[PDB]
Amino acid sequence: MVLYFIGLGLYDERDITVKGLEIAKKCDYVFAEFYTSLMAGTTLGRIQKLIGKEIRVLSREDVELNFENIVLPLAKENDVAFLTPGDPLVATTHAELRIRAKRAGVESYVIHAPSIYSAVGITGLHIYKFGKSATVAYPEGNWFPTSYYDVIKENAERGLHTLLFLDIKAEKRMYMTANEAMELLLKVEDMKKGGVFTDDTLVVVLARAGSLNPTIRAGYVKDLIREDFGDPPHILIVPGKLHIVEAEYLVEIAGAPREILHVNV
Amino acid sequence: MVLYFIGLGLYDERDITVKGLEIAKKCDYVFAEFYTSLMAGTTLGRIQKLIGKEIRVLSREDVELNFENIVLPLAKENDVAFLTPGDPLVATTHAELRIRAKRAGVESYVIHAPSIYSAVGITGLHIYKFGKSATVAYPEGNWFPTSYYDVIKENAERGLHTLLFLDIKAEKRMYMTANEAMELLLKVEDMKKGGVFTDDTLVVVLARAGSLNPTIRAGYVKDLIREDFGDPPHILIVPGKLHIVEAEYLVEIAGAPREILHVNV
Numbered sequence: 001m002v003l004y005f006i007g008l009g010l011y012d013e014r015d016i017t018v019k020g021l022e023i024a025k026k027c028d029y030v031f032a033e034f035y036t037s038l039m040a041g042t043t044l045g046r047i048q049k050l051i052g053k054e055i056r057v058l059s060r061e062d063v064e065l066n067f068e069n070i071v072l073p074l075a076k077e078n079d080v081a082f083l084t085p086g087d088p089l090v091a092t093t094h095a096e097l098r099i100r101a102k103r104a105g106v107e108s109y110v111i112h113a114p115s116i117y118s119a120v121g122i123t124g125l126h127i128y129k130f131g132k133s134a135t136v137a138y139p140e141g142n143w144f145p146t147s148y149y150d151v152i153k154e155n156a157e158r159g160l161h162t163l164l165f166l167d168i169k170a171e172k173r174m175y176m177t178a179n180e181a182m183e184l185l186l187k188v189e190d191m192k193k194g195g196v197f198t199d200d201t202l203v204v205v206l207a208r209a210g211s212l213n214p215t216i217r218a219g220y221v222k223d224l225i226r227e228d229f230g231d232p233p234h235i236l237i238v239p240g241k242l243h244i245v246e247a248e249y250l251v252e253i254a255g256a257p258r259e260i261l262h263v264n265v
Numbered sequence: 266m267v268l269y270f271i272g273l274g275l276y277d278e279r280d281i282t283v284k285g286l287e288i289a290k291k292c293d294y295v296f297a298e299f300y301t302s303l304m305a306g307t308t309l310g311r312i313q314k315l316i317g318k319e320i321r322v323l324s325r326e327d328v329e330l331n332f333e334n335i336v337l338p339l340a341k342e343n344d345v346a347f348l349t350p351g352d353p354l355v356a357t358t359h360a361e362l363r364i365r366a367k368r369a370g371v372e373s374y375v376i377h378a379p380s381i382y383s384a385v386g387i388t389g390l391h392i393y394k395f396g397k398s399a400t401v402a403y404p405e406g407n408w409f410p411t412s413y414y415d416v417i418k419e420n421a422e423r424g425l426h427t428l429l430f431l432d433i434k435a436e437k438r439m440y441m442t443a444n445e446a447m448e449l450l451l452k453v454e455d456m457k458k459g460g461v462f463t464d465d466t467l468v469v470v471l472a473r474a475g476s477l478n479p480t481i482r483a484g485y486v487k488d489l490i491r492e493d494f495g496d497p498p499h500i501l502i503v504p505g506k507l508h509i510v511e512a513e514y515l516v517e518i519a520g521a522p523r524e525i526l527h528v529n530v
């Protein structure tokens with residue numbers, strides 16, 4: 001009669017919370033989805049071994065189209081868990097799944113875990129200064145989307161930071177790198193010419209947040225565009241004007257050029 | 266000779282990640298602060314029992330003025346942990362402590378935990394739609410903080426949601442309620458008269474996120490301003506323009522007036 005939405009956290013099998021693990025262990029059935037994001041520091045086998053339960057993986061279609069025929073039926077006479085990378089309900093369409101549970105007469109509870117939305121605090125950028133967030137998508141065929149560029153412009157214009165999620169092809173296990181994102185934004189800039197993203201724009205790259213050894217780098221596009229940030233996933237951030245303390249952290253912790261202490265403050 | 270910044274999560278001792286617990290258990294010394302937020306479902310005693318270590322709690326003064334004299338010295342010859350509610354770097358000035366660590370020749374690592382910043386997902390509001398955040402601070406003497414009002418105005422004009430962290434005076438055991446925040450906002454509205462926050466404004470309240478049964482309520486200020494939302498901590502959210510599914514969730518899960526199902530596109 002109960003469905004538990006449990007987050008797996010940021011990077012590996014140990015990023016689930018103690019509460020999430022203990023509840024998952026008591027569930028009769030355990031489902032998971034890795035189409036919204038993958039757990040790059042672990043494997044399904046390692047997550048299964050930790051939880052001590054067979055984990056049934058669900059595809060995007062399984063969830064978006066058939067959540068009520070696959071997960072909810074079991075949740076009516078058993079305790080069921082639905083595992084997702086990061087924090088539950090962060091993915092845009094997941095909150096609606098709780099409405100489906102209610103419509104099916106199934107109680108649901110949420111067990112939180114770390115999300116990139118809060119983990120970016122490790123960049124030293126003040127959380128309150130982040131504005132609207134966006135995703136950088138690959139142009140395809142006759143389609144060249146550029147809304148994420150407008151988001152950066154509107155945020156920066158108001159002195160706010162912009163969190164940029166990079167395109168991911170979950171099943172194909174293909175990720176957009178920070179380098180690719182930068183190249184794309186420069187191309188968008190050439191078309192928009194709004195002076196929003198250029199070789200002189202200061203950016204911050206966060207890779208493998210959650211890991212004990214994440215990659216945190218800050219610098220100008222002209223210098224970071226061809227830098228190796230390691231294995232994905234990569235997160236790109238275009239900060240707005242910096243508080244001197246944010247600048248100092250980026251220099252001391254993220255290897256940013258001392259130049260930002262006067263150019264971007 | 267390492268220093269770990271480990272988050273304890275949203276509500277109780279089980280909101281710590283497995284990674285954080287495993288590491289905290291093996292540290293020689295464990296420090297913590299409980300002035301940046303309130304974990305309403307646990308006690309120092311329960312946390313110590315879980316980690317199996319005696320925890321020395323530090324005051325804001327101990328940290329802000331003496332972190333390098335109290336904690337850092339021990340990190341030179343031992344493994345030290347510094348625990349905090351939620352995520353250690355979110356809506357705190359703790360990130361700056363990593364700079365102090367580096368200057369003392371002490372390596373530091375960050376272990377994230379669920380944060381109220383991403384827990385907003387449980388309100389059904391798309392997290393990417395949140396704009397600049399702010400804190401409703403208690404007036405002090407003749408000083409009456411009001412900038413948080415302008416933040417709401419700025420986001421609202423852009424159709425973005427506004428997360429409002431609420432004040433806390435841990436040494437006085439004072440935790441601002443959503444009701445108190447609403448009263449203060451109405452007072453600022455009377456003074457500024459910008460039509461930003463009135464009795465007809467739609468607001469969302471999230472209390473004790475992390476617990477299994479948090480209070481999630483949505484409705485007009487005129488109706489919620491005197492409602493009992495349970496024990497602290499609370500956060501207040503002023504949504505911007507709503508998507509159809511966001512409104513549906515607020516009505517179905519947060520008990521909002523069915524009339525908000527209607528969106529003025």
Ligand SMILES: Nc1ncnc2c1ncn2[C@@H]1O[C@H](CSCC[C@H](N)C(=O)O)[C@@H](O)[C@H]1O
Binds near residue numbers: 350351357
């Ligand atoms: N479990 C919880 N439920 C509701 N609000 C919470 C909360 N935990 C923190 N807050 C809100 O955030 C304020 C503390 S700000 C510090 C936040 C913390 N680092 C984190 O990562 O969550 C509180 O005064 C309250 O308004």
Ligand code: NA
Binds near residue numbers: 130131132392395
């Ligand atoms: Na945000």
